[PDB]
Amino acid sequence: ELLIREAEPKDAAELVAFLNRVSLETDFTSLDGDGILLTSEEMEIFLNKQASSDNQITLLAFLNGKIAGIVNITADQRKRVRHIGDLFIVIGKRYWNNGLGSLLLEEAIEWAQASGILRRLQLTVQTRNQAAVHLYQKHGFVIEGSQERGAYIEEGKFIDVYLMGKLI
């Protein structure tokens, strides 16, 4: 049983818990053992901001009533760049490779298309993170550049990232 819907402030405590869990599952994102470093009350503030924002959104995936994944679009408000959404997605490791990430990413893209503001979606992905690269390409993201020392892992060493975007 799977529901995908937009985050509500009542999800804050459980979202913080989810993000601290996934922070310990991999080193593919900026999240590390220090976790999300946000209180449930800070996260409420965040989720309210996202919900009222015309060019930003947090969508949550629930598996039998518990959050199993999140996709985030954030965006700057200045007119130069307000049409650009920066994407972030993470799925609980035990649920990988069952299509949740594609489901969530497709919902995000649909929302972004409907927004009327967002005309570009983008992100940075570690080149070694081939699952992410493949998923993003599958949904029409292209590799737009590659950057040396785009990330630091394992207490020394530096690794490369790709930049990826999709026009909408």
Ligand X SMILES: CC(=O)SCCNC(=O)CCNC(=O)[C@H](O)C(C)(C)COP(=O)(O)OP(=O)(O)OC[C@H]1O[C@@H](n2cnc3c(N)ncnc32)[C@H](O)[C@@H]1OP(=O)(O)O
Q: Which residues bind to its own copies, rule: CB under 8 A?
A: 27, 29-32, 34, 76, 78-84, 119-120, 122, 144-153, 158, 163, 165, 167
Burial 122-138 (b: 16+ CB within 10 A, else e): bbbbbbebeebbebbee
At closest approach, how far in Å is the CB of 157 from its own copies?
A: 11
User: Which CB sits closer to ligand X, 47 or 100?
Assistant: 100
Binding at 152: pick from its own copies, ligand X, none (beta carbon under 5-8 Å per type):
its own copies
Binding at 94: pick from its own copies, ligand X, none (beta carbon under 5-8 Å per type):
none
Question: What are the residues whose beta carbons fall under 8 Å from the beta carbon of 19, sequence distance 6 or more?
Answer: 31, 35, 36, 38, 70, 90
At closest approach, how far in Å is the CB of 78 from its own copies?
A: 5
- Say what angle helices 40-52 and 12-22 make with each other, to 10 degrees: 110
Q: Identify whether the C-beta of residue 73 lies closer than 8 Å to the C-beta of residue 107.
A: no
Binding at 91: pick from its own copies, ligand X, none (beta carbon under 5-8 Å per type):
ligand X
- φ, ψ of residue 14 to 5 degrees: the values are -75, -30
The contact set with ligand X (CB under 6 A) reads 26, 28-29, 87-91, 96-102, 123, 125, 129-132, 134-135, 138
At closest approach, how far in Å is the CB of 100 from its own copies?
A: 24
Strands (E), 8-139: 57-63, 66-74, 84-91, 120-126
At closest approach, how far in Å is the CB of 148 from ligand X?
A: 18
CA distance linking residue 57 with residue 66, whole number of Å? 19
User: Which CB sits closer to its own copies, 32 or 41?
Assistant: 32
